[PDB]
Amino acid sequence: NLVDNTNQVEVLQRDPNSPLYSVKSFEELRLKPQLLQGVYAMGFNRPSKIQENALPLMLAEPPQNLIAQSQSGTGKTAAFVLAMLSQVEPANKYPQCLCLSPTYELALQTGKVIEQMGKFYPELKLAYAVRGNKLERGQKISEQIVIGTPGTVLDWCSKLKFIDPKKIKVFVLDEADVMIATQGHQDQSIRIQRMLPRNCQMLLFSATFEDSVWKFAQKVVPDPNVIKLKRE
Amino acid sequence: MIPEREMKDFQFRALKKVRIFDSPEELPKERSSLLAVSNKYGLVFAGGASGLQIFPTKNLLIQNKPGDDPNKIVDKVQGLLVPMKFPIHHLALSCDNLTLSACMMSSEYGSIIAFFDVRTFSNEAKQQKRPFAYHKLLKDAGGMVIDMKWNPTVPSMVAVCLADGSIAVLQVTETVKVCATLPSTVAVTSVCWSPKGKQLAVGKQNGTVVQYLPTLQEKKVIPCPPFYESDHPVRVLDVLWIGTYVFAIVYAAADGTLETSPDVVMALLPKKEEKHPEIFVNFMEPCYGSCTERQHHYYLSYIEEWDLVLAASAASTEVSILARQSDQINWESWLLEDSSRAELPVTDKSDDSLPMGVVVDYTNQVEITISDEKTLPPAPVLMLLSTDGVLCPFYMINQNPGVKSLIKTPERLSLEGERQP
| b/e per residue A62-77 (b: at least 16 CB within 10 A) | ebbbbbbbbbeebbbb
Helices and strands (H, E) in chain B, number of each type: 1, 32
Per DSSP, A45 falls in state -
Q: What residues have CB less than 8 Å from B377, skipping those under 6 apart?
A: B367, B368, B405, B407
Question: Which residue of A152, A181, A190 is in closest CB contact with B338?
Answer: A152
A184/B341 Cβ within 8 A: yes
| b/e per residue B216-248 (b: at least 16 CB within 10 A) | beeeeebebbeebeeeeebbbbbbbbbeeebbb
Rounded Cα–Cα distance for residues B99 and B154 (Å):
12
Query: How many CB atoms neighbour CB B70 within 10 A?
Result: 18
Give the amino acid at B294.
R
Kindly list the residues from chain B whose CB atom is less than 8 angstroms away from the CB atom of residue A152: 338
Query: How many CB atoms neighbour CB B64 within 10 A?
Result: 17
Q: Angle formed by the axes of helices A76-87 and A33-41, to 10°?
A: 150
| Residue B345 near chain A (CB below 8 Å) | yes
A152/B1 Cβ within 8 A: no
Please report the beta strands in B151-269, taking only residues with DSSP state E, as ranges in sequence order. Answer: 157-162, 167-172, 176-182, 188-193, 200-204, 209-212, 218-222, 234-243, 246-253, 263-268
| Residue B337 near chain A (CB below 8 Å) | yes
| Residue B2 near chain A (CB below 8 Å) | yes
B339/A190 Cβ within 8 A: no
Per DSSP, A227 falls in state E
Rounded Cα–Cα distance for residues A21 and B129 (Å):
67
Kindly list the residues from chain B whose CB atom is less than 8 angstroms away from the CB atom of residue A183: 13-14, 70, 339-341
Question: Which residue of B13, B339, B346 is in closest CB contact with A190?
Answer: B346
Query: Strand, coil or helix: what is A28?
Result: helix
Distance from CA of A149 to the nearest CA of B (A): 7
Chain B interface mutation, best of A136, A183, A218, highest count of B Cβ atoms under 10 Å? A183
| Residue B329 near chain A (CB below 8 Å) | no
Helices and strands (H, E) in chain A, number of each type: 8, 8
Q: Given the DSSP bridges, would you call strands A170-173 and A201-206 parallel, antiparallel or unpaired?
A: parallel
Paired residues of B240 in beta bridges: B248
Q: Which residue of B has its CA nearest to A101?
A: B338
B350/A219 Cβ within 8 A: yes
Strands across the sheet containing B133-137: B88-93, B99-106, B110-117, B133-137
Distance from CA of B151 to the nearest CA of A (A): 36
Q: Could you give the C-alpha distances from A215 to A67, A113, B158, in angstroms and in order?
A: 11, 29, 48
| Residue B259 near chain A (CB below 8 Å) | no
Q: Could you give the C-alpha distances from B62 to B16, B17, B42, B79, B184, in angstroms and in order?
A: 6, 8, 15, 15, 45
Q: What residues have CB less than 8 Å from B125, skipping those under 6 apart?
A: none
Q: What residues have CB less than 8 Å from A6, skipping those under 6 apart?
A: A232
> Could you tell me how many residues make up chain B?
421
Rounded Cα–Cα distance for residues B355 and B340 (Å):
18
CA dihedral A154, B70, B285, B209 (to 10 degrees): 180
Kindly list the residues from chain A whose CB atom is less than 8 angstroms away from the CB atom of residue B341: 151, 183-184
- Given a contact cutoff of 8 angstroms between Cβ atoms, the answer to whether B220 and B209 are in contact is no
| b/e per residue B325-350 (b: at least 16 CB within 10 A) | eeeeeebbbbbbbbbbbbbbbbbeee
Q: Which residue of A has its CA nearest to B286?
A: A159
Rounded Cα–Cα distance for residues B318 and A111 (Å):
29
A180/B338 Cβ within 8 A: no
Phi, psi of B68 (to 5 degrees): -75, 145
Rounded Cα–Cα distance for residues A7 and A10 (Å):
9
To one decimal place, what's the resolution in Å? 23.0
DSSP state string for B210-238: EEE-TT--EEEEEPPPTTS-SSS-EEEEE
- Smallest CA-to-CA distance from B395 within B61, B7, B52 is with B61
Which DSSP helix (H) or strand (E) runs through B270?
Answer: none
A190/B338 Cβ within 8 A: no
Kindly list the residues from chain A whose CB atom is less than 8 angstroms away from the CB atom of residue B2: 137
- Given a contact cutoff of 8 angstroms between Cβ atoms, the answer to whether B100 and B45 are in contact is yes
Kindly list the residues from chain B whose CB atom is less than 8 angstroms away from the CB atom of residue A208: none
A131/B337 Cβ within 8 A: yes
| Method of determination used here | cryo-EM
- Given a contact cutoff of 8 angstroms between Cβ atoms, the answer to whether B300 and B237 are in contact is no
Rounded Cα–Cα distance for residues B417 and B421 (Å):
13
Distance from CA of B69 to the nearest CA of A (A): 6
- Given a contact cutoff of 8 angstroms between Cβ atoms, the answer to whether B87 and B49 are in contact is yes
Chain A interface mutation, best of B338, B344, B392, B394, highest count of A Cβ atoms under 10 Å? B338
Distance from CA of B348 to the nearest CA of A (A): 10
Kindly list the residues from chain A whose CB atom is less than 8 angstroms away from the CB atom of residue B394: none
A191/B2 Cβ within 8 A: no
Distance from CA of A71 to the nearest CA of B (A): 19
Kindly list the residues from chain B whose CB atom is less than 8 angstroms away from the CB atom of residue A181: 69-70
Query: How many CB atoms neighbour CB B155 within 10 A?
Result: 17
Q: Which residue of B has its CA nearest to A152?
A: B338
- Given a contact cutoff of 8 angstroms between Cβ atoms, the answer to whether B95 and B154 are in contact is yes
Q: What residues have CB less than 8 Å from A147, skipping those under 6 apart?
A: A98, A99, A100, A101, A107, A110, A111, A114, A126, A127, A128, A129, A130
